Amino acid sequence: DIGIVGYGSYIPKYRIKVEEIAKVWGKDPEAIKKGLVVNEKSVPSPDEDTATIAVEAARNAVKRAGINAEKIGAVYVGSESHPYAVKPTSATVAEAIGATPDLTAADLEFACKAGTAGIQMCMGLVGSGLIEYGMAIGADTAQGAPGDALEYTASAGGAAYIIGNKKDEMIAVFNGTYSYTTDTPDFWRREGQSYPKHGGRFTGEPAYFKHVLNAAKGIMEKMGTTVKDYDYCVFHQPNGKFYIKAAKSLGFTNEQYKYGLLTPYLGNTYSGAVPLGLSNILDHAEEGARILAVSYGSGAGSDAFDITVTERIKEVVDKAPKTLDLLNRKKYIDYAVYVKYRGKIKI
């Protein structure tokens, strides 16, 4: 009934290795790589932001859908780094893809789950017949606090999904969705401050794992499924460790979770993390493959999805750049140039 008709991704070209950050701050890089299961992260060009990344991903999704953007009836951008405090990214993206003016739009906020929240909104609008196609994007240019452990994982990227009703155009089908949400102060940022604050070890078991695992078990109960019913999986990935712990807890093997894990070479792109991992799965998946996708946001909340791939997948994969190709087209930079680009130098 409801499915993905097209999807697209974008990652900028600059990277920075853990070695380059630790060198400056006087830490052991090998300990960090092993502790976090992270090697390097992405860095946006100083002329790039969430809007531009969202546009790249949106335009790529249109190529794969093969539709006329004028037909898109809603555009939703989920982010933590909207270029304005008050001016919608989503409007800029619609204008940049030619979707304007006959559509609704909104900018979404819910930590790193903002991106997947928009998918559920589009599913509703398409399923109810209120629109013909909807676009949900998740994109971020995350910034980690200098000297803090989040600086090793805070990266830039995004992915877009177009939702539709036409079986001939669906590359994947939603079987069901479920969400787990509570009020959890694991991670936050106040309006004045430059970088967020967090509860350290509270971000784990009572927040990420509580919500990611409750969302996963919940949708499997709703769907009457077990881990074995699924071919691939993707969880939120603030670091490699959390991802693998969650995946192994639920009974997934490496073959099932490998494609969804991008953080070790991409970093944590926040609201683009699961959207990007999902896209890498779709670049590899075959007809009939069944996917479990579960996001997480501090706040807190998780969005779970149960998706089945169709035969159309192989018609569209090459209609836009593949997430792995984007991830490997890279130029390395050191910490000085990194903080210059990211605007981390006082003036």
């Binding site: 052991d28 300990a31 502790g35 509860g199 350290g200 070890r201 509270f202 078991e205 009572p206």
Partner: protein, 389 residues
């Protein structure tokens, strides 16, 4: 001056307990201790609580009133005793002296700590050091004990491998402990290659920040037979305490804890036994080196030789058994409860309780000793238990 005994012991799991509140913890320990001792709530005549953190973890002082209130035991007198990481043992000793005095017959001695609620625990654990002349200049609590390890290595030639074996043993022992924070085996290489906190110590040498609570029911030796079988009663032969300089730099010798020598010697005298008669010992090994030093100061081996006797791992039938539960590093170090837990382990070991069934030490003589240390050595409290009165 009455003889004092232990009739019950209760403990929560030690670790990162997010859901369990500070209140939920001390209750769970108190009810377990009450239930094991076969006493009613009304039978408690007084309580003695240890909690170093108090108002630095949560901002709550006056914890005694809070604990008595929420345990439902109002109007029983409740008192807080503080000596940093030695608060647990100090609460026990206070409880012991109150039974010996005749003013109370059945007294609960417990300790509780809620370290996970603070963002940064270092500032609290650093409270046990001199704030003006150690912390102020950037000497973190692990860095102080590391400087002890460096000086000990300088004087006695201890090698990092010898020190690291202490942690391998502890973790192996902790896999047999249900209440231990860490239940995984390790290796020498994993210990030595772990991330460093303060040279020469690594994360696998340092004890973690821990939530937990433990409680004992102490009772008059004669009335004890009223609640417990004569079989399951353990007698407190000695409860001693001593003092040393608060700052490490003011110590006469940094390789030994004079307060432990003073306290342990006094306990051995009162019990009229020698170190050779101890079957099980629980020592304060928050940073491993401290475990080695205490094994010497309690008289189990010569100064500077602890590294050599531990390398052989002295399963071993003819040597004292140290930290059967995993010690502070592996079992967990909830500051206020540690001193209580230490003794609760000796109680289990000497009464051959099911709880320590999988980690049961051989008991030829029927004696155990515990050494609880506050900070870098400024306070030491020793408890000597026996199966015989």
């Amino acid at each position: 001056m009455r003889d004092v005994a232990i009739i019950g012991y209760g403990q929560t799991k030690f670790g990162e307990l997010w859901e369990d509140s500070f209140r939920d913890l001390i209750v769970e320990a108190g009810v377990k201790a009450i239930k094991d001792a076969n006493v009613d709530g009304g039978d408690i005549d007084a309580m003695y609580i240890g909690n170093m953190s108090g108002g630095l973890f949560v901002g709550q002082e006056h914890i005694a009133s809070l604990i008595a209130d929420h345990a439902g035991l109002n109007p029983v007198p409740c008192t807080r005793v503080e000596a940093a990481c030695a608060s647990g043992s100090l609460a026990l000793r206070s409880a012991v002296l109150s039974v010996a005095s005749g003013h109370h017959d059945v007294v609960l001695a417990g300790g509780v700590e809620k370290m996970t609620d603070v963002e940064d625990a270092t500032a609290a654990i650093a409270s046990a050091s001199d704030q003006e002349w150690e912390a102020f200049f950037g000497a973190t609590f692990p860095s102080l004990y590391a400087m002890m390890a460096r000086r000990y290595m300088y004087q006695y030639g201890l090698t990092i491998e010898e020190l690291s074996m202490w942690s391998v043993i502890a973790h192996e022992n902790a896999t047999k402990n249900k209440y231990a924070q860490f239940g995984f085996k390790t290796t020498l290489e994993q210990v030595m290659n772990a991330s460093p906190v303060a040279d020469p110590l690594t994360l696998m040498h340092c004890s973690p920040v821990s939530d937990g609570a433990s409680a004992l029911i102490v009772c008059d030796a004669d009335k004890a037979e009223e609640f417990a079988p004569k079989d399951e009663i353990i007698y407190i032969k000695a409860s001693t305490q001593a003092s040393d300089t608060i700052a490490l730099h003011d110590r006469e010798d940094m390789t030994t804890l004079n307060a432990a020598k003073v306290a342990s010697e006094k306990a051995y005298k009162l019990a009229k036994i020698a170190p050779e008669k101890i079957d099980v010992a629980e020592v304060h090994d928050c940073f491993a080196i401290n475990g080695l030093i205490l094994v010497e100061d309690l008289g189990f081996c010569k100064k500077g030789d602890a590294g050599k006797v531990i390398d052989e791992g002295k399963d071993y039938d003819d040597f004292v058994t140290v930290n059967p539960s995993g010690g502070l590093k592996a079992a967990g170090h909830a500051l206020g409860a540690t001193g209580i837990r230490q003794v609760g382990e000796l109680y289990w070991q000497l009464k051959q309780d099911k709880e320590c069934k999988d980690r049961q030490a051989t008991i030829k003589n029927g004696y155990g000793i515990a050494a609880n240390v506050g900070g870098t050595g400024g306070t030491v409290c020793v408890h000597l238990l026996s199966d015989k009165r």
